Amino acid sequence: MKAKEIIEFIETFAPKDLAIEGDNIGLQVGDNLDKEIKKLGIALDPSLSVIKKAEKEGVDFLFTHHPLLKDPIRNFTGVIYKKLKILMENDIILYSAHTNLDICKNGLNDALAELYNLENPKPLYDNGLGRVGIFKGSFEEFLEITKKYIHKNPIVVKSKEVDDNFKLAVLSGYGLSQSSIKYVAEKADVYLSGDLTHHSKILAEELGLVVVDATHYSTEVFGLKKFKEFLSSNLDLEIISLDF
Amino acid sequence: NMKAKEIIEFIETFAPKDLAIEGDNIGLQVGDNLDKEIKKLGIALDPSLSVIKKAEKEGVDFLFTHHPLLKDPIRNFTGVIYKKLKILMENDIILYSAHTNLDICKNGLNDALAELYNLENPKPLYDNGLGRVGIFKGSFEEFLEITKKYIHKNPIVVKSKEVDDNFKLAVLSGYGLSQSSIKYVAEKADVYLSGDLTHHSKILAEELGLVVVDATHYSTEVFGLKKFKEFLSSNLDLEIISLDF
Amino acid sequence: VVNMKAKEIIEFIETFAPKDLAIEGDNIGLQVGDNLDKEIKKLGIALDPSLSVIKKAEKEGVDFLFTHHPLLKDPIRNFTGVIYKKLKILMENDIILYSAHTNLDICKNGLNDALAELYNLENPKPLYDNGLGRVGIFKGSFEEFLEITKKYIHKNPIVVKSKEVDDNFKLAVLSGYGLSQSSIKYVAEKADVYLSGDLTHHSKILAEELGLVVVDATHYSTEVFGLKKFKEFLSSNLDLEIISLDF
Amino acid sequence: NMKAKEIIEFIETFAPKDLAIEGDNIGLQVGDNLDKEIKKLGIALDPSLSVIKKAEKEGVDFLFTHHPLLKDPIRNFTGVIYKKLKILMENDIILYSAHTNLDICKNGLNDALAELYNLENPKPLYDNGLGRVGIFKGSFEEFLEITKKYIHKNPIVVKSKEVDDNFKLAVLSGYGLSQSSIKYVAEKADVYLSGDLTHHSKILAEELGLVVVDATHYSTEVFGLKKFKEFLSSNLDLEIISLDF
Amino acid sequence: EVVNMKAKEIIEFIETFAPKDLAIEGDNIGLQVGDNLDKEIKKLGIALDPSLSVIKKAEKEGVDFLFTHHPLLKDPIRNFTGVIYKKLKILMENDIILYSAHTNLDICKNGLNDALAELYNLENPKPLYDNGLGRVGIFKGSFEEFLEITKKYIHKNPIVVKSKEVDDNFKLAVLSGYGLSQSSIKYVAEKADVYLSGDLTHHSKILAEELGLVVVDATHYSTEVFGLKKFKEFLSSNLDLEIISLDF
Amino acid sequence: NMKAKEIIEFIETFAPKDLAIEGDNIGLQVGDNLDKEIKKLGIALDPSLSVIKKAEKEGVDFLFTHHPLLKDPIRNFTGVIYKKLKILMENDIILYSAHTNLDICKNGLNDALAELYNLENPKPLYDNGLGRVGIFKGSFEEFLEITKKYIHKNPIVVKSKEVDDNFKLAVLSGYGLSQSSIKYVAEKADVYLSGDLTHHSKILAEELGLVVVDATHYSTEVFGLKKFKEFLSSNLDLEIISLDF
Ligand SMILES: [Fe+2]
Ligand SMILES: [Fe+2]
Ligand SMILES: [Fe+2]
Ligand SMILES: [Fe+2]
Ligand SMILES: [Fe+2]
Ligand SMILES: [Fe+2]
């Protein structure tokens, strides 16, 4: 397969126009997209160690969920220099699907909704991010699923008691901003996401929203693993994971 | 028999308001007549709803907090903010905050951390005076043991590289672990002690080789806030209690 | 005469003056309040949520305070001085404060319609694109228009008589503050005479240059005319004691 | 006798342009050759169309106004501004303004008001130098009588509270009655004399207990402008007339 | 059979050919200087620029209505001194109307860009930019023939940035006026082999060389005046009015 | 045996980075390890693709340019910038720029022009230090002949007016012929020597009566850049070649 064909397949699953405004999705680093691809690597982050591992494992198409850069730059030194040097010197293509992969059908948020078997799931935000629906079971059962499948030691902000058959909101990645807490508190009893910080914990306690931080990494890697299986099943291509 | 304005004078002598960084909402949060006599002072990290309820329950007349009531301004009064204000106003509880001016001032929250680790030749970490950095005269393991004994029993350690003895330690009380902070501090220190670590910042520290120790936002401020509470208790003839620590 | 829940009063008011009619950025709706199941015995109406209005509301046992102007235009993050005094009174008495501002200016039979109907404007149209103000032909003389103004709105309006006004002229009306320099420039292309409130020096000079006759019947009176109509409307439909506080 | 540039130098010695507040469009409004000989100088508050027509009718060569011709810039020349510019350009009448620099300078428009009321220990009201404030050594009624005799016969008085003798009086020539000004001045004075009162500012003054006297924008400026005109007449051998006062 | 027209009739005619809503966002088109548009017009003058020398020549020649492609001012002002004072004074004391059709004249059918596309007989021309500016299509011939046309009809010594060899039947982009900004070079490199426009500067030359876009600078003036002459001929054919050109 | 950081130190001593105007992207463009030993330094006006290819071909390990690689920041790497970065990174070629700091410094690109024309009592043209202006002690024709001999054989001359002997000459290396520059310099000089003339600026200069001589952006910079190259060659024991001049 050619790089552009891999990109075509991925964009059919996760169309770029589903990405939220300003999200740096698509080609991160690359020039010739007609090149035949020897090995595909999948990672959450285009980190320096991921990129070093890509070169070591002979990966020539590196797919990541997070973009290489959010903020644009005009000097190339330090860590970004080391990263670009490896990608360019080895002609490794770097391509990202970020919020388009969060939002698309069977994408990262759908993977969470399906894991918890949410009843009548809907998008949490108007832009399509996150899912919300009824968890048909006890709070304890929800926690066991979280601990078994996502993360063993989640932070639980137990802001109030949770009855059976509650509204569960899920957001893969960083969903625990203060403004998100305020928003989700109007829509759900429990909010499962990642990257909890102090001010957001206090706000959830005030609003009575139960928050479960199963970490940014794990709430995304759960769906990313499913995405990797989908690619492996459909493409005649060697595919490896680099930071999971 | 102290007046609210005299408590405010005492606090602002320790932590002058002009030390606060641009835009920080410090000073009087809620209150009108500052000639009011104050019988009981409450100290808290956060002006949360539960802290404010506890203040009312305990007969607190002056509520001092590190964090301001609001960061972003509002023009409607409903829900939680309505509930908070209602309690403060019907009890005429004054709410007053010292935030980054208390981080930055001499013997404030960052100085308290610097003194705990006995930093050699300490300097402000940032140009605006936030944080401290200097040499820790000992091993990484000794630095960790101090952290576990006095700050947080189990901090997250991002061990991005090996750390030699007599290393450069930067400390910042509260939330110091933004991505831009990681990048900045990596140029100034081997080890960075602060709070509120998140994923992108963890990855960035590993790339840069900066060892990051997250002893939490709460604990890295409450360490110094307890010192500030003792300082107030020693100098003021006033009943003083802590509400969320 | 019975008691209503606050949410029922709000629902009625918003059917008359829908919130989506408000112009961009206008702070309309709930100003101060939490539980809208609160039972309401006495509804108070005011132009302004002033300190004296709020004191009178407390004094008169008002449970629901409706005002045309919002409590705050610019948001705040400290609560001291006057705003402290106002909120303390409202919160201690759990008085709900609710506002309908430009949505009440713009809606059918709202404040601007009330003026257009008073002057019996022929073929009235909205004055601005956002629906604010009204303009049409006044079927009469300038003096007849002034006497109507004097009888119903304000007895001694300031008249900037920029030119002679012939019978059957184009009259623009805007309830409240409609006399900014940019408004004078805009309305000068649309009307012979502009009736509104809050005239200041640079706007007077500008009107004289443009030949636009301006009548300042005051911000207060040009809104209160329609606010009285609104109060009568509520009194006719709601079984509630309803009082006016600053008019 | 005199060239325009000499008239300008004299005015700018009295009211230096660097006194004008940021963004104020002061100085040469319309003109090219400043060596032009000037026989007749006209002074006006506003560079209005009727003032400019009168300048042309009276053979004015140099038109001085307090207010600038334009606050906001334009890139098309039609309607009233076309009419104004055509009269000035076709007659090579120079139009020059001193606006807030004339408000702020020593013996300028605000100083003229301070001196009329014989304010004790006067200070600038704002940090940028606008307005004056000091003690009025007399009763409220005496202050009002001075106001009515020398400034405007029927000022609007917002009597927000009782005013005792020897009160703090703030004065600002022109438009000083914005909401943000009311809030500011309420901290500094018992009584505020200025112009261009509107509804929201009246309500706010009542809430704050600030007594406000609107003696109008026009009259509170023209008082000092008449003084300025006499000063010019005393010092320049030039025919000098006033156009809108 | 030469008569006087009212200014508003001239404006109506021009705006029928080049409607104001074709002008790009922010473009200062329409009436520049003037008040009464019932003014009777005996002599219409056409110019590229409302320069001081053009306005002086207009006054000298008794022009009553001055039409220019470029607006008098792009950026607004609030003081009237120096050159703009000199210009406005001449226009106002003589009550000469100044009116401009700028990008609406660039974009309209048979406007300045179409005139270039037609001169090069572009095959299947399309607007170069989405807002309608410029034209692009196939030049059915050799690069050398394209050059000969350029030299004969537009400008005798055009600057050629020969970034690569150009084969016959290439994609030719044209933009009348200043089309050679860096952002334009980048954009057009994706759409054409050759870019004919005006006002080349150093950074743009380097960028064109990097991208392999052949750029031909036939000057800002000449790439617009070619079409402006057509426009003047069009007016002369349709209005029974004396019409002269002032800076061409 | 000299290190990249030592080359950079030498250059920044001559042209300190703090002389660069606000926002100018000067300093290290591409590079990581500045302890690297440098065997061959290349000097160029532009970090163009052809310059960078030539640098690789000639074995240049330190590439110095006047113009920065990027003015506007990017967050994707494709096309031409990909090709350029790849060549630099795969060969570990350092790219370093001194832009307006080299324009402004003593004996920098603008001083070099001022010295060529032997300007009398030269001063900076702009407040930020850009450009130079002073008296040319000779005729306009003598000035043109110097230009033709040393800078550019055939400069564009916009002869807006006649020029008397001993006129005021302003020089600015590179692109100095913006419309706002034309307006500014017309107040300070009779003749303006710079580069990159476009139509609107030509018209404006004719209106103002400012004589403009466009000796091209490239040539007015390369003149001083050659001087800078000789200065480096005279002081550093290093192979130094020029790449686009
Ligand atoms: Fe993420
Ligand atoms: Fe904090
Ligand atoms: Fe109003
Ligand atoms: Fe004024
Ligand atoms: Fe043009
Ligand atoms: Fe340059």
Q: Under 8 Å CB-to-CB from B143, ≥6 apart: which residues?
A: B117, B136, B167, B169, B191
Angstrom distance (rounded) from CA D43 to CA D47: 9
Query: Does E63 contact chain D (CB < 8 Å)?
Result: no
Closest CA to A81 of B208, B11, F42, F4: B208
Q: In E108-169, which ranges are E strands?
A: 123-127, 135-139, 159-161
Angstrom distance (rounded) from CA D71 to CA D20: 14
Contact B113, B122 (CB under 8 A): no
Q: Under 8 Å CB-to-CB from D67, ≥6 apart: which residues?
A: C202, D45, D46, D47, D97, D99
Closest CA to B105 of B218, B231, B237: B231
Tokens of D71: 């606050």
Tokens of C234: 């509520």
**Residues from chain C contacting residue B32 (CB–CB below 8 Å):** 80-81, 84-85, 88
Which residue carries 């890697």 as its tokens? A221
* CA A187 vs CA A149, A166, A207, C168: distances in Å: 24, 11, 12, 58
Contact E41, E5 (CB under 8 A): yes
Residues E71, D75: C-beta atoms closer than 8 Å? yes
Which residue carries 């043991």 as its tokens? B145
Cα Rg, chain F, nearest whole Å: 19
Planar angle of CA F222, F225, F227, nearest 5 degrees: 120
Q: Is F146 exposed, middle or buried (0-12, 13-18, 19+ CB in 10 A)?
A: middle
Q: Which amino acid belongs to residue A38?
A: K
CATH number for the domain that contains residue B150: 3.40.1390.30
Which residue carries 């008359």 as its tokens? C16
Q: How many CB atoms lie within 10 A of CB D71?
A: 13
Angstrom distance (rounded) from CA A160 to CA A209: 7
Task: Return left, alpha or beta for E124; rule: phi > 0 is left, psi -120 to 50 is alpha, else beta.
Answer: left
Q: Residues 176 to 235 of C: which have CB under 8 A from any D CB?
A: 176-177, 197-198, 200-202, 205, 208-210, 218-220
**Residues from chain A contacting residue F69 (CB–CB below 8 Å):** 74
Query: Which residue of F56, F65, F70, F75 is the best one to mutate when testing the A interface, meaning the one whose CB has the most A CBs within 10 A?
Result: F75
Query: Does C72 contact chain D (CB < 8 Å)?
Result: no
E108 CA to middle of ligand 3, Å? 47
Closest CA to A241 of A64, A8, A30: A64
Q: Under 8 Å CB-to-CB from F98, ≥6 apart: which residues?
A: F11, F12, F15, F26, F64, F66
Closest CA to D114 of D226, D18, D224: D224
Q: Which amino acid belongs to residue E40?
A: E
Q: Is F91 helix (H, G, I), strand (E, B) or coil?
A: coil
Closest CA to B28 of B5, B60, B55: B5
Residues F82, A24: C-beta atoms closer than 8 Å? no
Closest CA to E248 of D171, E231, E240: E231
Angstrom distance (rounded) from CA C72 to CA D76: 38
D120 and D17 in a common domain = no
**Which method was it determined by?**
X-ray
Q: How many CB atoms lie within 10 A of CB D126?
A: 19
F30 CA to middle of ligand 1, Å? 29
Question: Who among B30, B32, B74 is closest to C75 (CB)?
Answer: B74
F208 and F222 in a common domain = no
Going by DSSP bridges, is the β-strand pair A93-96/A26-29 parallel, antiparallel, or unpaired? antiparallel
In sign, the C-alpha dihedral spanning F225, F230, F235, F241 is positive
B203 and B116 in a common domain = yes
Q: Is F122 helix (H, G, I), strand (E, B) or coil?
A: strand
Which subunits sit against A, judged by 3+ Cβ pairs under 8 A? B, F
F194-198 long-range contacts, CB within 8 A, separation 24+:
F194/F131, F194/F220, F195/E202, F195/F219, F195/F220, F195/F221, F196/E201, F196/E202, F197/F156, F197/F158, F198/E178, F198/E199, F198/E201, F198/E220
Chains B and D touch (3+ CB pairs under 8 A): no
Identify the H or E element spanning E147: helix E143-153
Contact F48, F15 (CB under 8 A): no
Query: Which residue of D32, D74, D92 is the best one to mutate when testing the E interface, meaning the one whose CB has the most E CBs within 10 A?
Result: D32
Provide DSSP, D161-176: S---SSEEEEEEEEE-
Angstrom distance (rounded) from CA B18 to CA C96: 38
Query: Does F46 contact chain E (CB < 8 Å)?
Result: yes
Which ligand minimizes its atom distance to the CA of E227?
5
Least CA distance to D24: which residue of chain E? E78
Residues F76, A31: C-beta atoms closer than 8 Å? no
Closest CA to E226 of E138, E158, E136: E158
E67 CA to middle of ligand 5, Å? 14
C214 and C107 in a common domain = yes
A235 and A189 in a common domain = no
Q: Under 8 Å CB-to-CB from D206, ≥6 apart: which residues?
A: C50, C51, C52, D158, D160
Q: Which amino acid belongs to residue F51?
A: V
Which residue carries 């494709």 as its tokens? F78
In sign, the C-alpha dihedral spanning C131, C132, C136, C139 is positive
A224 CA to middle of ligand 2, Å? 34
F212 and F177 in a common domain = yes
* CA C64 vs CA C60, F114, F233: distances in Å: 11, 79, 86
Q: Which amino acid belongs to residue E71?
A: P
Contact F49, F80 (CB under 8 A): yes
Question: Who among E34, E75, E80 is closest to D30 (CB)?
Answer: E80
Q: Under 8 Å CB-to-CB from F159, ≥6 apart: which residues?
A: F211
Q: Is C158 exposed, middle or buried (0-12, 13-18, 19+ CB in 10 A)?
A: middle
Residues C32, B82: C-beta atoms closer than 8 Å? yes
Angstrom distance (rounded) from CA A204 to CA A178: 8
Query: Does C51 contact chain B (CB < 8 Å)?
Result: no
D18 and D78 in a common domain = yes
Write a three-state SS string for chain A. CEHHHHHHHHHHHCCHHHCCCCCCCEEEECCCCCCECCCEEEECCCCHHHHHHHHHCCCCEEEECCCCCCCCECCECHHHHHHHHHHHHCCCEEEECCHHHHHCCCCHHHHHHHHCCCEEEEECCCCCCCEEEEECCCHHHHHHHHHHHCCCCCEEECCCCCCCCEEEEEEEEECCCHHHHHHHCCCCCEEEEECCCHHHHHHHHHHCCEEEECCHHHHHHHHHHHHHHHHHHHCCCCEEECCC
Question: CA-CA-CA-CA torsion for E192, E198, E201, E207, nearest 10 degrees?
Answer: 0
Q: B35 CA to chain A: closest CA distance, Å?
A: 31
C49 and C149 in a common domain = no
Domain that holds residue F229: 1-99+217-241
Instruction: Tell me the β-bridge partners of B166.
Output: none
Contact B50, A205 (CB under 8 A): yes
Question: Who among B30, B32, B69 is closest to C85 (CB)?
Answer: B32
Identify the H or E element spanning C191: none
Contact F212, F196 (CB under 8 A): no
Question: CA-CA-CA-CA torsion for A106, A108, A114, A118, nearest 10 degrees?
Answer: -110
Contact C32, C54 (CB under 8 A): no
Distance of CA B219 to the CA centre of its chain: 9
Contact A189, A134 (CB under 8 A): no
Angstrom distance (rounded) from CA A124 to CA A172: 12
How far apart, in Å, do the first and last CA atoms of chain C sit? 23
Closest CA to C172 of C187, C160, C182: C187
Tally of domains in chain A: 2
**Residues from chain A contacting residue B208 (CB–CB below 8 Å):** 78-79
Provide DSSP, E183-215: HHHHHHTTT-SEEEEE---HHHHHHHHHHT-EE
Q: How many CA atoms lie within 13 A of F70 on its CB side?
A: 19
Distance of CA D99 to the CA centre of its chain: 7
Query: Does A243 contact chain B (CB < 8 Å)?
Result: no
Identify the H or E element spanning E118: helix E112-119
Cβ < 5 A residues, ion ligand 6: F 174
Question: Who among E30, E74, E81 is closest to D32 (CB)?
Answer: E81
**Residues from chain D contacting residue E78 (CB–CB below 8 Å):** 25, 68-74
C120 and C28 in a common domain = no
Query: Does B80 contact chain C (CB < 8 Å)?
Result: no
Question: Who among C177, C202, C208 is closest to D199 (CB)?
Answer: C177
Question: Who among F49, F175, F208 is closest to E83 (CB)?
Answer: F208
Instruction: Tell me the β-bridge partners of E160.
Output: E216
Contact B119, B169 (CB under 8 A): yes
Q: Under 8 Å CB-to-CB from C220, ≥6 apart: which residues?
A: C47, C197, D199
**Residues from chain F contacting residue A28 (CB–CB below 8 Å):** 76-77
Provide DSSP, D178-242: -HHHHHHHTTT-SEEEEE---HHHHHHHHHHT-EEEE--HHHHHHHHHHHHHHHHHHH--SEEEE
Which residue carries 């996150």 as its tokens? A130
Q: Residues 18 to 37 of E: which have CB under 8 A from any D CB?
A: 28, 30-35
E95 and E8 in a common domain = yes
Q: What is the resolution of this structure in A?
A: 2.0
State the greatest distance between any 2 C-alpha atoms of chain B, in Å, as a whole number: 57
Tokens of E90: 């001449």
C202 CA to middle of ligand 3, Å? 20
C59 CA to middle of ligand 3, Å? 25
Contact F196, F216 (CB under 8 A): yes
Least CA distance to C93: which residue of chain B? B90
What does the DSSP 8-state code read for residue D26? Answer: -
A209 and A106 in a common domain = yes
Closest CA to D103 of D119, D126, D121: D126
Compute φ and ψ for B163, nearest 5 degrees: -120, 120
Residues C177, D196: C-beta atoms closer than 8 Å? no
How far apart, in Å, do the first and last CA atoms of chain A sit? 24
Compute φ and ψ for D27, nearest 5 degrees: 105, -155
State the greatest distance between any 2 C-alpha atoms of chain F, in Å, as a whole number: 57
Angstrom distance (rounded) from CA F225 to CA B153: 62
In sign, the C-alpha dihedral spanning C135, C138, C142, C147 is negative
Compute φ and ψ for A70, nearest 5 degrees: -95, -50
Query: Does E85 contact chain D (CB < 8 Å)?
Result: yes
**Residues from chain A contacting residue B195 (CB–CB below 8 Å):** 198
Which subunits sit against D, judged by 3+ Cβ pairs under 8 A? C, E
Angstrom distance (rounded) from CA F63 to CA F85: 13
Question: CA-CA-CA-CA torsion for C1, C3, C8, C10, nearest 10 degrees?
Answer: 90
B152 CA to middle of ligand 1, Å? 27
Angstrom distance (rounded) from CA F173 to CA F111: 9
Closest CA to F97 of F17, F13, F173: F17
How far apart, in Å, do the first and last CA atoms of chain E sit? 26
Q: How many CA atoms lie within 13 A of E65 on its CB side?
A: 26
Task: Return left, alpha or beta for F79; rule: phi > 0 is left, psi -120 to 50 is alpha, else beta.
Answer: left
In sign, the C-alpha dihedral spanning A176, A178, A183, A184 is positive
Contact F64, F98 (CB under 8 A): yes
Contact D91, D121 (CB under 8 A): no
Tokens of D32: 């090219």
**Residues from chain F contacting residue A71 (CB–CB below 8 Å):** 73, 75
How far apart, in Å, do the first and last CA atoms of chain B sit? 26
- Strands of the sheet containing A61-64, edge to edge, are A26-29, A93-96, A61-64, A40-43, A239-241
Going by DSSP bridges, is the β-strand pair D27-30/B27-30 parallel, antiparallel, or unpaired? unpaired
Distance of CA B120 to the CA centre of its chain: 22
Instruction: Tell me the β-bridge partners of A73.
Output: F74
Question: Who among F70, F78, F86 is closest to A74 (CB)?
Answer: F70
Planar angle of CA F184, F189, F192, nearest 5 degrees: 85
C66 and C128 in a common domain = no
Angstrom distance (rounded) from CA C62 to CA C53: 11
Provide DSSP, E72-93: S-SS-BS-B-HHHHHHHHHHHH
Instruction: Tell me the β-bridge partners of B108.
Output: none
Angstrom distance (rounded) from CA D183 to CA D161: 15
Q: How many CB atoms lie within 10 A of CB E75?
A: 9
